[PDB]
Model the fold of this input.
Amino acid sequence: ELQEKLIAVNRVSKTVKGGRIFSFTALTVVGDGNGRVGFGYGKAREVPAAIQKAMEKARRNMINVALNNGTLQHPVKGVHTGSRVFMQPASEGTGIIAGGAMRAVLEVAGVHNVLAKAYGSTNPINVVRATIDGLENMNSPEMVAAKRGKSVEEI
RNA sequence: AAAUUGAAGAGUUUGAUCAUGGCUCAGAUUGAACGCUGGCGGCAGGCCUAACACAUGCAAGUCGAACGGUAACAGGAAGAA
Ligand SMILES: [Mg+2]
Done:
């Protein structure tokens, strides 16, 4: 019922006394389509084995995101080691406007309308981390209402 | 009542990685030029260079209801016609 898709696959190497030892890495994102999204990173000698490992890694380490209506509550800015991510909620019907890694993360999470831009490095492993960081730190008016002790007359 | 409801990335330094950093590409546009090809119509546009030199024709005339006047055409009439 939940959706899963593969971000990128990369071949890595570890040289030994005999020579190189080739390996394959898989970055995947798993989301239920509501705002519960996670990512998994796995390593294996074979591409099917590597992608499978990332699949179970993503089912654990799931997070929850509070969405308004298929979109973000407010503009959000997610920063990881070398990647800067700016996402802001857009109007209905505008669709998803984001880079490769961010679009997959966003679409499996369940955000249909969003304007998202990536600054800094565009390494898939780090932009996915930055995107997850933004969806965390974004908040909901009811949790803010309890946070400030001011009820929900703000909106 | 309606009057911007708007932001995408990729390749390349390494045995492999992250970062930094340049180079390149995917878009739109043009008073365009060239190559290959070419049926029609509508609208628009068309010396960006030598403010270089110019044959030829035209591009500022009009008024007789300002004036003298009759070169020219037509009308009008004295008269050997
Ligand atoms: Mg000129």
Observations:
- The first strand of chain A starts at residue 3 and ends at 13.
- The first helix of chain A runs from residue 47 to 59.
